[PDB]
């Protein structure tokens with residue numbers, strides 16, 4: 009078995025739910041030893057099994073070790089202190105100021121261990137009174153303005169039905185941890201790392217938020233004879249090729265849509281004109297025509313459809329964990345490497361599985 | 370100036386638009402020297418501007434970088450790139466699959482000459498076969514990955530998320546892989562080839578949702594109607610759920626067979642929403658948010674982007690930085706990760722196209 013980037017490193021994962029464990033999952037896939045620190049009875053996400061025939065817990069805790077502990081007790085605190093002494097990285101995703109209360113804060117652990125990298129993941133940053141609140145993917149996203157510009161028939165704010173902020177924050181946190189490890193390796197500095205879910209959500213909208221601190225058409229989903237097609241062809245070469253393929257050469261030199269900046273302003277009329285031409289063929293027919301001509305177009309798939317597409321199978325996105333009846337298919341982490349496989353087939357640990365190994369007597 | 374993790378490393382950035390350059394932007398903030406390789410006249414994204422002159426997709430992702438203008442089709446250009454690659458630690462490319470191989474600048478071409486070079490490829494669909502060979506952009510890749518699922522629109526058209534979620538997420542993932550590769554080289558002496566697909570990232574962002582269809586809740590957690598406006602509440606945990614029922618004056622809901630258990634609340638979400646909104650009718654959304662937040666529950670208003678930039682929390686986090694000299698500056702948002710021992714920020718403006726041609730294209 010080939011060497012991995014993080015072989016020999018030890019991580020203490022004090023995190024729960026999605027964002028924090030996902031970062032740990034990435035570190036596991038890169039070969040680190042990641043030990044979950046859970047409350048008695050295991051992490052609460054373990055019991056949140058909304059599937060019957062473990063959604064949040066299972067895909068993010070493969071190959072991890074586990075210790076179970078009651079951080080109310082002094083005994084526990086001392087065990088964590090001794091365990092932290094042997095750790096390279098500590099991951100915590102509690103409310104700001106929580107870890108300090110437990111006596112396991114940055115100053116507490118780093119005083120004992122000068123090689124320890126301390127990574128903190130919070131909802132809002134904890135840089136002041138406003139950032140002290142606890143948060144979750146839904147609340148953080150809405151507060152960061154991710155519902156903006158999306159109208160609903162009921163007038164209700166659009167809720168994005170997947171954990172976009174939490175999953176993105178996990179990769180950003182893992183990114184920062186890897187950066188800190190490089191910083192320690194090259195410059196001999198064991199740093200304190202901070203990632204805020206709010207900051208990550210703001211970064212995902214940065215181009216749009218930029219306009220208020222100081223689009224590009226055609227790029228939308230268009231109605232056809234049957235179904236919808238998603239087309240992106242705003243550059244002059246593609247925009248022109250598009251007009252020819254749909255049989256509308258007049259649109260190319262049309263004063264409303266002649267210039268790129270002009271198309272964006274007159275998006276409403278542009279949509280009407282395009283959908284008028286697209287009425288000739290079904291969305292499937294249009295997609296095949298445009299793709300053959302090198303234009304960017306596709307169908308808007310559902311989740312059920314996506315897993316069944318040839319492209320999905322082509323990218324080797326899934327792996328199986330467990331022995332037989334309890335074998336579940338999970339999605340791998342996205343980054344791929346040539347010299348090793350960034351995946352682990354070992355299942356998640358039972359709560360406190362490694363208490364004997366890691367907790368001092 | 371304190372040391373940064375990538376001081377002394379050199380990166381060749383062949384990428385365009387958002388996803389690729391953002392990864393380079395991350396490397397710049399971490400102290401790496403990143404050189405843009407652009408076509409004559411510069412990157413195409415440099416021209417996508419707004420009215421006051423703000424390149425929305427170029428400016429925030431190319432701060433502190435260096436630029437080299439060149440026509441990769443010519444033999445002279447290829448040779449200059451080969452010499453330039455010899456001095457590089459990392460090569461970033463975001464072209465269509467098979468493009469670099471055609472130009473003679475593929476992984477095998479560069480790594481044969483330079484054995485320490487890390488080759489990073491970012492594609493739309495992975496290029497692992499015929500289906501993944503197509504070019505793509507944030508919008509198209511997201512829609513194909515199923516991101517329009519479950520969101521109703523007035524027109525009945527698929528819901529288009531109005532920001533580049535996939536491109537921005539892919540940028541951080543690509544930077545993540547590059548940093549991992551650099552660690553791999555330092556510790557194991559291996560210079561690897563790393564591949565990141567925007568489609569794979571988009572799939573990963575929906576991992577929890579797609580997972581259900583691969584093996585064929587948590588209420589209350591939604592946006593709720595009040596007397597005035599909507600409130601976003603997340604309180605499915607028994608501790609939060611009980612306190613929520615108390616604060617809204619509905620103790621009956623706690624042991625109500627319909628909503629007693631957490632699984633029951635998930636199944637009967639429709640009736641629960643009706644019950645909750647009946648209680649929330651008493652006060653405006655703003656009044657409810659302050660009450661719940663004071664009691665430690667997770668709740669907020671759904672802000673617009675315009676509202677978001679004016680909030681105290683936004684200013685508290687030092688999210689913005691100004692690029693340029695004096696009054697001639699444009700405000701941009703920084704990369705998210707923060708570090709205590711250094712400042713992951715560069716205030717330098719982007720280079721002009723071909724600004725460093727004299728420095729790097731030689732002919733001294």
Ligand SMILES: [Cl-]
Nearest residue numbers: 321322323324
């Ligand atoms: Cl395969």
